[PDB]
Amino acid sequence: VKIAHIHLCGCTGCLISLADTYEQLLDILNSVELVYALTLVDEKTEIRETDDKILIEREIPDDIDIALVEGSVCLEDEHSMKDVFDARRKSKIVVALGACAATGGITRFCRGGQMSKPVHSSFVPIGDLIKVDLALPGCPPSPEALVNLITAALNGDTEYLEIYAELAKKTEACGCDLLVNVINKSLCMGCGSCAASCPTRAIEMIDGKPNVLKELCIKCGACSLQCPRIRFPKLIEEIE
């Protein structure tokens, strides 16, 4: 009932996707109290006054139940690394919200050379440093898939969240997962659902097999998540 939005090396796009549950946002903010989110709330303020300084700091509170962590971790920035360990220390459930936190995403391409922080060049998904409990791919994951995660987390629907808890153990995604796991292993039937999931239109169906345009893939993991020949839990088979 206490949720927190941690923002590391991201773009806030995942947070905006959460905001794009307009009607369900007012239904979620009554069932859960938000306790930390720099972009939304002034928590948690502590002032320290000496004879020569007045320090007004906003730190992550304790007793966070669910923590939506967005963005990767910069290994050359002390604050970025302090906040990923601090979020893990103070949250019972941490969720790798988006490809940046889950698998690196676009930040995998970072290599520095750019001032004004010429030393900043190493960016890793949060899973490489802390244990993560759930992972949500996509750049960004849809508002629909987000509502589903939050609903299942509050209702204890472990069966639904299993596919994301399993993802939390792998911190590497790519467009080539479709080839190495589905095409090369004689599983791809050619439905094309992966091409329809891609946010950069990097997948193109040729000869009934997905062709990845490698210079357009941002490694968001949406296509491998969708492939029903990789993961097809039996819960999907129940309809009405």
Binding region for other proteins (CB under 8 A): 7, 9-17, 19-20, 22-23, 25-26, 38-42, 52-58, 74-77, 79-80, 85, 105-107, 109-123, 128-129, 139-140, 199-201, 215-216, 218
The answer to whether the beta carbons of residues 100 and 10 sit under 8 Å apart is yes
Asked if 192 interacts with ligand SF4 (CB under 6 A), we say: yes
Min CB(186)–other proteins separation in Å: 30
Nearest CA-CA partner of 171 in 91, 106, 105, 215:
105
Calculated CA dihedral for residues 111, 84, 169, 222, nearest 10 degrees: -60
CB-closest chain residue to ligand SF4? 13
Sequence-distant (≥ 6) Cβ neighbours of residue 85 within 8 angstroms: 129, 130
Q: Which stretch binds ligand SF4 (CB under 6 A): 21-29, 79-87, 93-101, 115-123?
A: 93-101
What the block records as the tokens of 121 is 């060049």
Nearer to other proteins, 153 or 222 (CB): 222
Beta-strand relationship, 203-206 and 2-7: unpaired
- Site of tokens 């898939």: 145
Judged by beta carbon distances under 5 to 8 A according to partner kind, the member of other proteins, ligand SF4, none in contact with residue 52 is: other proteins
Min CB(99)–ligand SF4 separation in Å: 4
Enumerate residues 104-133 that contact ligand SF4 by CB under 6 A.
105-106
CA pair distance 227, 175, nearest whole angstrom:
12
DSSP state of 142: P
Q: Quick count: other Cβ atoms within 10 Å of Cβ 36?
A: 22
Nearer to other proteins, 71 or 227 (CB): 71
Asked if 139 interacts with ligand SF4 (CB under 6 A), we say: yes
Residues that bind ligand SF4 (CB under 6 A): 10-11, 13-14, 70-71, 98-100, 105-106, 139-140, 173-175, 178, 182, 188-194, 197-200, 202-203, 210, 212, 217-223, 226-227, 229
